[PDB]
Amino acid sequence: TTSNFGIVVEQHLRRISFFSTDTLEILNQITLGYDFVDTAITSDCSNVVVTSDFCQTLVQIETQLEPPKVVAIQEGQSSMADVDITPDDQFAVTVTGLNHPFNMQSYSFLKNKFISTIPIPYDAVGIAISPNGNGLILIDRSSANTVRRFKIDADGVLFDTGQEFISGGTRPFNITFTPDGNFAFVANLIGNSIGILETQNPENITLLNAVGTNNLPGTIVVSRDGSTVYVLTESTVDVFNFNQLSGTLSFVKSFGHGLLIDPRPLFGANQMALNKTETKLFISANISRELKVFTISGKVVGYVAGIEANGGIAICHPD
Q: InterPro entries of this UniProt entry (predicted)?
């Protein structure tokens, strides 16, 4: 029972790998022959979820044994890409990938089945569930340069509020909450800016402002105290400080990962994660097909052996 590990998708091998945060070597490689996209992991740290696009199949696996044991394989109504889990670990929620129709789908970890399905707009990418427990869901709408607000209840039933909000810049692509659920950050992919939304009151969401970034911001990682924010770019990681009273993101510095990556074809899937000691960044390079590890200061620390990165990435974080 170790909690120094993570999981990464390799879409072209129709495979996934578990790797150690410590040694930086593979742990277990499960090959199921699906169209894999993104992953989530549980608070508990005990169960994982992987999605698939054209295969429209979600797989669930238990992580605490000799070799990792997959335990459910369900097909959804339609395709799947970004995933988040509710903060209580009871449900997993999925958003559309490339092939239509376009639906949001929730899945019960207890019942090991899907529970609700609702249609989402054509331009929908990225998903984020608030850690409050208030059950607010927000997704990006890339062509309407707006973000839309959804609901999931205690049962897993999904709802469409049809409330949309400016994203700050243009081509909103990925969203990430603060650990307390009071702000959300939207990566605006051509706008080259992060948007910042007031989400403490989900009946009254508002955009406050937007700070700019290097070319082509993909994924937002935020440290567990909420004061440091890391953004994955075509060429760099950017770090900002966040000020939780005034709602202001302040640039600190950037460093270049020297990797080839391209968010677009992974529909909102996080290609970066922080170890449990928020001391190092793990990056999943789409196109260099490498899992590189850096320190948050930019120091490169080394890559993992023989993983052809291609898709989402998640690291173990108990809490």
A: Host-pathogen_enzymatic-act (IPR051200), Lactonase_7-beta_prop (IPR019405), Quino_amine_DH_bsu (IPR011044), WD40/YVTN_repeat-like_dom_sf (IPR015943)
CB 70 within 8 A of CB 86: no
**Could you give the CA distance from residue 172 to residue 268 in angstroms, rounded to a whole number?**
10
What technique determined this structure?
A: X-ray
Does residue 200 contact residue 182 with C-beta atoms inside 8 Å? yes
Name the domain count of the chain: 1
Q: Resolution of this entry in Å? A: 3.0
- Smallest CA-to-CA distance from 63 within 33, 105, 19, 106 is with 19
* Token pair 């910042």: residue: 196
Of 83, 95, 93, 7, the C-alpha closest to 45 is 7
- Return the CATH number at 145: 2.130.10.10
Of 121, 146, 256, residue with least CA distance to 207: 146
Cα 129 to Cα 176: distance, rounded to the nearest angstrom: 8
Burial profile 61-85: b = 16 or more Cβ within 10 angstroms, e = fewer = bebeeeebeeebeeebebbbbbbbb
| Residues of the domain holding 104 | 1-319
